[PDB]
Structure formats: C-alpha cells, structure tokens
Design a protein around this motif. Structure first.
Motif, mmCIF file in Angstrom:
data_model
loop_
_atom_site.group_PDB
_atom_site.id
_atom_site.type_symbol
_atom_site.label_atom_id
_atom_site.label_comp_id
_atom_site.label_asym_id
_atom_site.label_seq_id
_atom_site.Cartn_x
_atom_site.Cartn_y
_atom_site.Cartn_z
ATOM 1 N N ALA A 34 0.821 -1.215 0.000
ATOM 2 C CA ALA A 34 0.000 0.000 0.000
ATOM 3 C C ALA A 34 0.857 1.268 0.000
ATOM 4 N N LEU A 36 4.063 2.102 -0.443
ATOM 5 C CA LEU A 36 5.211 2.404 -1.322
ATOM 6 C C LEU A 36 4.848 3.315 -2.499
ATOM 7 N N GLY A 37 3.541 3.570 -2.660
ATOM 8 C CA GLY A 37 3.016 4.538 -3.613
ATOM 9 C C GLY A 37 3.183 5.993 -3.220
ATOM 10 N N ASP A 38 3.281 6.262 -1.919
ATOM 11 C CA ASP A 38 3.591 7.604 -1.404
ATOM 12 C C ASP A 38 5.086 7.674 -1.147
ATOM 13 N N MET A 39 5.671 8.869 -1.239
ATOM 14 C CA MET A 39 7.103 9.042 -0.936
ATOM 15 C C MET A 39 7.326 8.980 0.582
ATOM 16 N N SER A 239 12.287 3.102 -0.022
ATOM 17 C CA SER A 239 11.366 2.756 1.051
ATOM 18 C C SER A 239 11.372 1.253 1.314
ATOM 19 N N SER B 10 1.361 7.863 -6.581
ATOM 20 C CA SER B 10 1.457 6.972 -7.762
ATOM 21 C C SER B 10 0.841 5.554 -7.650
ATOM 22 N N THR B 12 1.022 1.966 -7.337
ATOM 23 C CA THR B 12 0.947 0.719 -6.542
ATOM 24 C C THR B 12 0.179 -0.415 -7.238
ATOM 25 N N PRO B 209 7.679 5.949 -6.451
ATOM 26 C CA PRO B 209 8.394 7.069 -5.789
ATOM 27 C C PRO B 209 9.379 6.587 -4.736
ATOM 28 N N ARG B 339 -2.270 8.195 -8.692
ATOM 29 C CA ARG B 339 -2.819 7.315 -7.656
ATOM 30 C C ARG B 339 -4.291 7.038 -7.920
#
Ligand SMILES: Cc1ncc(COP(=O)(O)O)c(/C=N/[C@@H](CCC(=O)O)COc2ccccc2)c1O
Ligand SMILES: Cc1ncc(COP(=O)(O)O)c(/C=N/[C@@H](CCC(=O)O)COc2ccccc2)c1O
Lengths: 359, 358
Positions: A34, A36-39, A239, B10, B12, B209, B339
């Motif tokens: 979940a 790892l999509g945000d920095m 991350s 982004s 996922t 990212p 996203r």
C-alpha cells in the motif's frame, strides 16, 4: 584472475544471510505494499527510525527519540546535510590519520579542518584545546584507521571540552562498532553526554553489505530544529530497503547475524594474526586489533610503502598503505582488512605479503 | 475515506511488483559475488550502460556511459552539480517551478533568478535580458504549468547557451515518459553542439516514488571536475541498480511503460470528461498533453486557500498552484491523477465542485 584481498573496502558475500534478507523483504513488501506509492517521510519512515532507535539504544546505549533520527543513503549524504545545519563558519577537527573521504568532503565545502594527532588513548584532548576548533569528528569504537579504542576517560575529556563553551559539537562516527573482540563494548560518547553536544552517526554498510547504502544520524534538538526549518529535503533510501531493514531487525535476524559474524570474524582474526606472527617472525607489529574488521601491520624493512604496494599488486594481493589516511619516517605500515578474506587464502595471503615486503 | 488528487503520489496497483522482485532475484544471483564490493562511484558500469541505451531510444539522448552519474533522487545529483559548477554561478528557474530545488539553491548560497512562462515555456526574452550562468527547465511537461516546450524554444535556449562561454542548461526531463495526443519531441541534449546541457532523469515516476534511482549525464568538462574530487561514494543500493538493469534489459520496463501509457491515457480522459461535465466551462484545463498531472483554473469568488480548506474538509487531498511560486480573481489547482482509482473519479470530481463553491 586469482587475487586474495586484505582490502578494508570489502565484505564477505558468502557469510551474509541473503536468503533471510529476501524473506524479510517479501514479508515487509506484503505488509506495506500500500504505502510504497507515497514518498517516504523526509527523515525516514517512522517505524524504521523506531526500529533502528531501539537497536542502537540496546547495542550502544544511545539515548534518543526516533524524531531525532535522519536516514540515510550513506554517511557522506548525512555529513553533507550536517555541515549545512552546523554554523557556516564553524571550524572542524578530524583525526590524523583519519577518514580522508570525509576530510575531502569538508574541504570541498571550503570548511577549515584542523587535524589532531593521536596518542595511546586516541584523539588528543591537548591538541584539541590547543587548536581550539568547534566541531570534532572522532571514531571512538575503532579509530579509523589506526585502530585505537577510545577509553572512557578520553570520551569524558572530549565531552567536558564540548560544554566548556557553547556552539561546540562532537560527531561520533560509530563505524565498525558492531564487533569488539577481547574487551567489552564501551558505550557511546552519546550515552555519556548529558548536554546533547553529540551527533551520533551509524551505518549498516559494515554489518550488512557495502552495497546496501543505509546509514543514520541522531540530531540534538537544536540541530533537529534547524533541519525542520529547511522543509525541502527528500529521503535518499528506497522505502523497500528501509522496510526490509526494519523487518530484518524486528524478526531478530539482524541480531542473529551480528552474533554469528562476531564469532566468525573473531576466529578469522585469530587465525590471521597467528599466521602473520609466524611467517613474519616478529619483523611485524600488529596494532589496533581489538575491534573493527581491520588492523594495522607495521613492518621492519627498508622498502618504501609505495613499492610494497607495487610488489603486492604484482603477486595478486589487494592491499592498502596507511599513507592513504594522512589528512595533512622509515617504518611503513599497511591496513589489513579481514572481512572479504576467505580462510583458505590466509596462509597464502600471509606468504604473498612476506614476498611483497622483501623479494 | 479519502480520494487523492496529489501529484506527489502513484500507481501501486499498476506496478508489476512481482516482476520487479523476479528481476531482482535474477540479478541477485547473476551478480551475487560483486555485492561484497562497493559500487563504482558513478554507479555500476553495466547499469549506466543499460540506462544510456534506454534514454537514446526513448528521448534521443546521445552519450557515453562514462559521463553518467547515478544517484539517490535528483536532489543529491543537483547538490553534486552545484559543487561542480563554478561556485559563484547564477541560476535561473521556471516561475512557477520546482520550489524544492529553488529552496536547495537559495539555501546553498546561490543567486537564483525566476523566469516567467509564455505559451511556449521558459521565456528566453527574460533569460537573455537577465543574463544568468545556468538554466533549469522542464521541456517535456513543465513543472508545474504543464506546457510542452516545443522545438523552436529548445533551439532558442541552446543558442543562448551556445553564443557565450560558461552557460549551462540543466535539462530536468522529469515526467517525460507520457505524451498522449501529441508528438514526443527530441531533448535539448540531443540538439546540442558544444555540450552545455546537463541531462537529468529519474525512475521515480515510471517505477515507484519509493525506489530512489535517478541519473544525470555530464559534459566532459564537468566530468573532469567530478573525477578531480575522487571521494564520492554511490548512494544507490547496488541490488537496486542491478534490479533496474535487469528490469530494462529483459523488456519488463518497456512493457510496463506501454501498459501504463494506455492505462494513463484512458484515465486522463475519463477524468477531464467528468470535470467538464460536473462544471462546464467553469473549469479551464491547461497542460494536459504530457506527464501525469494537469492544471485546472476555476471561475469563482473563493480564493485558492478557501477551496483547499473546504476540499480538505471533504477528505479530498489536493494541492494549489501558489505552492509552486518561487516568489488574481481566478484560482488554479494541480490535478495529479497517478494514484486516483477509477471508481473515485466521478465522486472526486463531485467533491471538488462543492469545495470550489459551497
Ligand atoms: C571511518 C568511516 N566512517 C564511516 C564510513 C561510512 O560508510 P557509509 O555510511 O556506508 O557511507 C566509512 C566507509 N568507508 C569505506 C572506505 C573508506 C576509504 O578508505 O576510502 C568502506 O566502507 C565499507 C567497507 C567494507 C564493507 C562495507 C563498507 C568509514 O571508513
Ligand atoms: C521538477 C522535478 N524534477 C525532478 C523530480 C524528481 O525527483 P526524484 O524523484 O527524487 O529524482 C521531481 C519530483 N517531484 C516530487 C515533489 C513535487 C513537489 O515538490 O510537490 C514528486 O515526485 C514524485 C511523485 C510521484 C511519484 C514519484 C515522484 C520534480 O517535481
């Protein structure tokens, strides 16, 4: 294509538990995919700073909240940031000999860097008071390169010196602190401090593989404030790496690797020091060998260091001289890193070196 | 729960994580022996070569591996860059621009001049008048405005750089991978005569990212400056560099970009469609030809900052165009759509109407 390495710039690949690292990576990737999509938070993922914070406080006595931690794509990236947070005109003081790469970094930011000779208890407190700098950079666990372990008396002297006046700081570079052999671990400068003039730096490079690139520093509130006032920073560790590490610590694997490797490198160091005293017959002195993953050999000989390197190179032996660590005498010394070195190569290595030193 | 229009977020869901791990295990065994050594400082040779091949195919960048420096995000390469440039340099960025790089430059001592935009990117009128040493620009999809600088201006800029010594261009090709109902265009570096471009790229947007793998290609002069240092250590994890080599060299990267090219095209439409249906001509869409965001201007009495606080009140994450000012009765908002799930389009589009007005 048959070299042997006494290089200090290398690690065992064979002894790293890589299959455990990948298992933790998966366990960690599944639980947090979940996210790892945000920095990552600029300082590092909170739980990762939490996981590191427990460990160093266990293994070294470091007193800190995770809010004080910054991770971490190697020390130079933290050290660079740190210069930007200390006062622009501050006068740095490094050991002599020292971690030359950090010297070069400091010079390259045009910082004034005094150099402190060492004595039997490590970085000299007389030279420090004489040369009156503002920021010490010291390697108390295993002086790099000389190997000296800084006793507690000297740790205190440094600390007293730092609260005599304001705006003085100590950068405790705890590189190569994970292993200490026929003595007990001394706890960190940072633990003994009551006045938060220490910036504790650490790295997983030495305890994992050099290729990983995850390091950390602990900032005292004043300097943490300064960090937060910039706002623009972006985390340098992947991350997934930060989380793999987290899982690798919490699972107990890291703690288990350390215990297994402590034993492995104690035996290799015995083997190797015994081998050296043998096929060098007392022509050799072995210095700073109670911690870390290297020691110094000083040899009785005419030959210039630089030629021993050429000859060693000729005999397919990767090896480095102490002159490398001069920041700014006919007994040449070499650095002997016993990390990559396989036990089958010990005998043969200690032969090749005897031929390199003489011929 | 929340619905994000963050440009800072982004996929996922749409990132081939099991393939990534497959390339890793493959790369991990093929090169296990070499992870006991630290990387070559500029980055593993085989990995720079892999990236050097790819950027020539995808952007027309012509260069040798030897000139490339791999690092952990643009910021760290940018820092390195400033230490290689003369030291008293004067810099020049897009206004609006990438504020973090502005702050890094101010913070580092640098005189930094802002440079307005016209319908074809960074003004050049301004550049020539204001006489800086170094430009920072974003030709493929302006950050934040979203203008695609066309060839003419790329030429203008090069000629500005070409017609006097010690002028540099930093080509920040951030967010290049995607161009939808238009042509992709050759980079400044490929049109360069005297080597005054520093091409910079990153895998952050095309991968996750999280990953932290970016690169810059240096002119010979500056490369001789990098080599004179001789202290730097690599900031990318060796495994990650090797995993990236495998991802590119096995076709999985190319594949992934095609997969995401289509999935982002049909999801950019379904969004604008829904906005121009839930507003009408009360929304103007700007800079939506390239990249993974666009702008929207809204005819309304509320200032930008009220529209955010009300939208934030409805669990609708969104960022405004004043964030990107280095230093109006029409507010403008940035609309990231990387996203954003499809089931949330219609419902986010609605929540934005109520926060614009009431
Ligand atoms: C004194 C000292 N302090 C800190 C570091 C920090 O390393 P970082 O956090 O990982 O960036 C090094 C790395 N020093 C490098 C050699 C320096 C030289 O002699 O040129 C060697 O690093 C490694 C060697 C073996 C296995 C793993 C790492 C340091 O020698
Ligand atoms: C102009 C520009 N150039 C380069 C970069 C790349 O930075 P790097 O990924 O570290 O190499 C960014 C990333 N800018 C970041 C911040 C934008 C802001 O300040 O609001 C947004 O980055 C990402 C968002 C989603 C997925 C991946 C990246 C840039 O905005």
């Amino acid at each position: 294509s048959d070299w042997i390495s006494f290089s200090h710039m290398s690690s065992d690949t064979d002894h790293f538990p890589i299959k455990s690292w990948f298992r933790c990576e998966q366990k960690a990737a599944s639980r947090s995919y979940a996210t790892l999509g945000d920095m990552s938070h600029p300082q590092g993922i909170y739980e990762v700073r939490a996981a590191i914070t427990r460990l160093i406080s266990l293994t070294r006595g470091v007193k800190c909240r995770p809010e004080q931690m910054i991770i971490g794509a190697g020390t130079q990236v933290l050290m660079q940031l740190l210069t930007e947070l200390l006062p622009k005109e501050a006068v740095y003081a490094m050991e002599e000999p020292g971690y030359r790469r950090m010297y070069q970094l400091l010079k390259n930011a045009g910082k004034q860097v005094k150099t402190i000779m060492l004595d039997e208890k490590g970085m000299s407190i007389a030279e420090i008071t004489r040369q009156q700098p503002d920021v010490l950079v010291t390697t108390p666990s295993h002086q790099f390169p000389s190997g000296t372990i800084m006793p507690v008396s000297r740790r205190i002297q440094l600390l007293n010196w730092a609260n005599e006046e304001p705006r003085r700081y100590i950068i405790e570079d705890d590189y190569d602190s994970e292993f200490t052999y026929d003595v007990e671990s001394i706890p960190a400068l940072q633990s003994l401090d009551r006045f938060q003039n220490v910036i504790y730096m650490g790295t997983f490079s030495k305890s994992l593989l050099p290729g990983l690139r995850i390091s950390y520093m602990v900032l005292p509130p004043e300097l943490l404030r300064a960090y937060k006032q910039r706002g623009y920073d972006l985390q340098t560790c992947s991350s997934l790496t930060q989380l793999t590490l987290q899982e690798f610590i919490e699972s107990g694997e890291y703690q288990k690797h350390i215990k297994k490797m402590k034993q492995h490198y104690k035996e290799k160091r015995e083997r190797l020091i015994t081998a050296l005293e043998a096929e060098f017959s007392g022509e050799v002195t072995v210095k700073g060998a109670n911690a870390g993953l290297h020691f110094v050999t000083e040899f009785d000989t005419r030959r210039t260091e630089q030629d021993i390197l050429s000859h060693a190179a000729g005999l397919q032996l990767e090896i480095f001289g102490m002159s490398r660590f001069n920041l700014k005498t006919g007994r040449p010394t070499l650095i002997i890193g016993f990390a990559r070195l396989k036990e089958e190569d010990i005998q043969e290595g200690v032969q090749r070196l005897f031929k390199a030193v003489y011929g």
